[PDB]
């Protein structure tokens, strides 16, 4: 006969010291954790309700803003605090974003400014300090491109020359500007694409596919010798400046307002296009738009890729800013306020969270890329909670209640009505094309990723 029941040790469970924290035992058994699916579901619902609780993206503005309305913004690729806003009255401003204030304000020209770039001039003469002064390239309207110096108080290794390192003249009004960042070659866009280098006051070379005015251009961030430039006859053109030969051209259906590359893939690019849409192209086969972002109401104005290679920010001529993932093709987030009208530029900051946004009003408002991730650093347990909830939500995505809650957002009134009007139009168009496919013999299925291309100049097999 062996008799032994359960013995419990109080010193095994409730410990000795009056400070030592209480011990926690476990047992992972499905006979002792009953409602697995329902518990995870209600946890997901609580998660998305808390996200709507903390949905507060807007975080502030810049100093007093300009006097006319922002038409260009450039982010310092070297630092994180620094940007430059080109207004429309004719004043450029260099901004510190640590305390949200103006460094400096220059009356650059008399007409508008057209474009900015912030950079590091590799003079053959001497190397300017890349910790003491940062150097802007400002392209005007009155036939001027100037290189400017700014004293930045990042460091204090030390403790003159407040403006106008040099000027550059031309014939036409330039429209766009940027810099091939190796040995500081820079492209300007006016009548024809003129490639300049710093010390020579003259264009090193010139290209143009046709005789059209050219309005915007951009070098790719990696494989850094390739130029992409749009064209007012609804065109995209590619150039390989190591060859100085214009590489390829395609003609679209509407003028492409802006363009940018993704710095995580380096041979794809997004084109913000006037028919209310955004397009995603690869560098090899321009025949297929790799994707189409399709959630606006009027002219888009600008896009930018993400440093994380996943987010695309766009700002419409409508009073709104949209944000998309690279995958889904319908806008995840939408920001807006009554205090801003016709956003003209939006850019990412170099740490994948903060969005600079220059609208037409003259303020510059910045936003969070996630409505939930408070910038504050967080303890371990809380970090685990937030991540566990996010993966749980991403799992339980397509249940209908979670779908309704997370998709439910607020948009302004005129825009809601205009979306429903466009929806009514699309339903009628569906009916008409269905009747046409009934009646005629063979009309080929023309996919939505190619319903917007009229033709390339170089073709394939």
């Amino acid at each position: 006969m062996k008799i032994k029941t359960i013995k419990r040790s109080a010193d095994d469970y409730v410990p000795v010291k009056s400070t030592q924290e209480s011990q926690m035992p476990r047992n992972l058994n499905p006979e002792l954790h009953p409602f697995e699916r329902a518990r995870e579901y209600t946890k997901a619902l609580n998660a998305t309700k808390l996200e709507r609780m903390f949905a507060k993206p807007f975080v502030g503005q810049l100093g007093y803003g300009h006097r006319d309305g922002v038409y260009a913004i450039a982010k310092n690729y070297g630092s994180l605090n620094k940007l430059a806003t080109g207004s429309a009255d004719g004043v450029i401003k260099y901004w510190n974003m640590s305390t949200r204030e103006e460094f400096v304000s220059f009356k650059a020209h008399y007409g508008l400014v057209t474009g900015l770039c912030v950079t590091q001039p590799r003079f053959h003469d001497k190397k300017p300090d890349l910790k003491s002064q940062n150097f802007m390239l400002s392209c005007s309207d009155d036939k001027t491109v100037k290189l400017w110096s700014i004293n930045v108080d990042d460091y204090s290794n030390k403790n003159n020359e407040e403006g106008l390192i040099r000027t550059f003249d031309g014939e036409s009004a330039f429209q766009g500007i940027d810099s091939h960042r190796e040995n500081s070659t820079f492209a300007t866009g006016g009548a024809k694409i003129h490639l300049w280098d710093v010390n020579r006051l003259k264009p090193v070379s010139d290209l143009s596919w046709g005789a059209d005015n050219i309005t915007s251009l951009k070098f790719n961030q990696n494989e850094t010798d390739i130029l992409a430039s749009t064209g007012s006859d609804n065109s995209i053109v590619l150039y390989d400046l190591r060859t100085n030969s214009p590489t390829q051209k395609i003609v679209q259906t509407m003028r492409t307002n802006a363009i940018c590359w993704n710095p995580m893939e380096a041979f794809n690019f997004v084109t913000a296009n006037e028919d209310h849409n955004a397009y995603y192209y690869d560098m090899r086969n321009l025949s297929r738009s790799l994707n189409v972002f399709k959630d606006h109401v009027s002219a888009v104005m600008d896009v930018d890729f993400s440093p994380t290679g996943d987010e695309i920010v766009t700002g419409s001529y409508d009073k709104s800013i949209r944000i998309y993932k690279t995958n889904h093709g319908h806008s995840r987030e939408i920001y807006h306020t009554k205090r801003m009208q016709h956003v003209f530029q939006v850019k990412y900051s170099m740490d994948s969270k903060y969005i600079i946004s220059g609208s037409d009003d003259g303020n510059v408002r910045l936003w969070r890329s996630k409505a939930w991730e408070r910038s504050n650093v967080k303890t371990t347990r809380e970090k685990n909670k937030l991540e566990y909830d996010e993966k749980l939500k991403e799992r339980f995505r397509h249940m209908p209640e979670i779908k309704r809650i997370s998709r439910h957002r607020h948009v302004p009134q005129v825009i809601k009505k205009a979306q429903e009007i466009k929806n009514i139009e699309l339903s009628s168009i569906k009916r008409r094309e269905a009747n046409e496919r009934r009646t005629r013999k063979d009309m080929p299925y023309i996919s939505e990723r190619k319903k917007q291309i009229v033709g390339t100049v170089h073709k394939y097999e």
Binding site: T5, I6, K7, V14, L32, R39, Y41
Partner: protein, 533 residues
Amino acid sequence: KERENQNKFERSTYQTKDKKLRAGLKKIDEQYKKAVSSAAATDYLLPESNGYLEPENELEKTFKVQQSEIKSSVDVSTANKALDLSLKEFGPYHIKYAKNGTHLLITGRKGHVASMDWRKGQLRAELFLNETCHSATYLQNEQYFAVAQKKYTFIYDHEGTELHRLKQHIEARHLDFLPYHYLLVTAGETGWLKYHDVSTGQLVSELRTKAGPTMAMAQNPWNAVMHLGHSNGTVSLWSPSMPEPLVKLLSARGPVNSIAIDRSGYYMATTGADRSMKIWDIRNFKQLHSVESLPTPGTNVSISDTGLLALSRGPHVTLWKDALKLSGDSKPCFGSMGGNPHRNTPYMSHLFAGNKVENLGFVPFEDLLGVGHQTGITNLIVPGAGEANYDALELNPFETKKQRQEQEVRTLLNKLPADTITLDPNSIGSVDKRSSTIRLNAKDLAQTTMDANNKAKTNSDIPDVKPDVKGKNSGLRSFLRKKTQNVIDERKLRVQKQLDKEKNIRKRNHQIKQGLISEDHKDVIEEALSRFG
């Protein structure tokens, strides 16, 4: 990475040329099986062992020992939890332990209600209600507890402060609680079931059992469903959404006397006043095996959390081991003919002298079962009752007050809505039943719309013509008679014409069968005047 626990650990369930999907599936299979094996590795960390009583002789049995020898033989802590009250003044007593195993709630039949810690002997609340109090339970903590009454059901505070007269639970007779939905379930002597949310204080639903007075009630925890035993001989499983019963079962003749359910959600024990007992497989609904001749109607039976069965039939109390296994040897039996080992002897017996067991319940996380009878309370020591090694995220049997209020707020924020209670606990995750098995697309939906708009030409709706099968069971004629006589439709014109066609072809086949003009007899006059029709 094969182990012995995978059989219990594994969560049961029901190929493309797409590379991303293939990689996703191989990824999820790899990490799923790694996780299951890791939990089977967490198996080692459990602190204690089960309790066991083993004979070591064949001359000695198991049941012949009693509480005297066991109290002498096992430790001072267990012998001190071997409670023995004496409440001779008020009527027979009924018992409910709280879920934490730490607060005893007793109710006499006359007015006595007491709520005690019982372990370090604190006494929270005592109330001498005069009206006949019928049943009682803690609801969510040791802070809120409900008793029934003669007529109206009352909710009392921890101290004895009266808090609620829940009007609409008329003549309540058996209470219980669902702790993961804050649900008070009351079975009345009205035949009505009433589910009440104690959180917002709102009756979630009623349910109408057309049998009669609710005889007995118990809940399946792993499904959170309510089991009622009526008077007709039926036991019926219900859920608070639909007004029809989920399932009915004819388990006893005469009236049902008691129901009880194992925590594993896979075994039910019912006992009926026709001196009978049934051991039921819940899922698939096959009454597994049945004892037919007990020498008393069983009052109350209850399940262990380790697989003991407790039977209470008047002045006796018996406990059986390993009873719920399926094989035809584990039949519970009062005696083994000539030491027949395949039969199942009683595991531990006891009598009471002059009482009658009013009911009984296991303690949660010790190994004792508490008996409530006509004048006193007793807590019998049993070796293998409770799982010694608990889990501390749901039920912490050692609970500081701060930890209490934290667990309580967390469960309020973590409640389930009352509508997710069904017969299968993965259905809230799974797909719709009616919708398609394979995911179709825009092209597929355009195709099926085109097919349903071509069906008017290709006759897709009405069953087609075969002269082979007999005209009684002929699908066209059964369709025609299933349709009424008074309205005539274009579909009906179509089915009339094709039934004429089936008659024609079947009569030609009858002529070729019986032996009239056959072997490709061609009617070329019909050929020649088909020109204009």
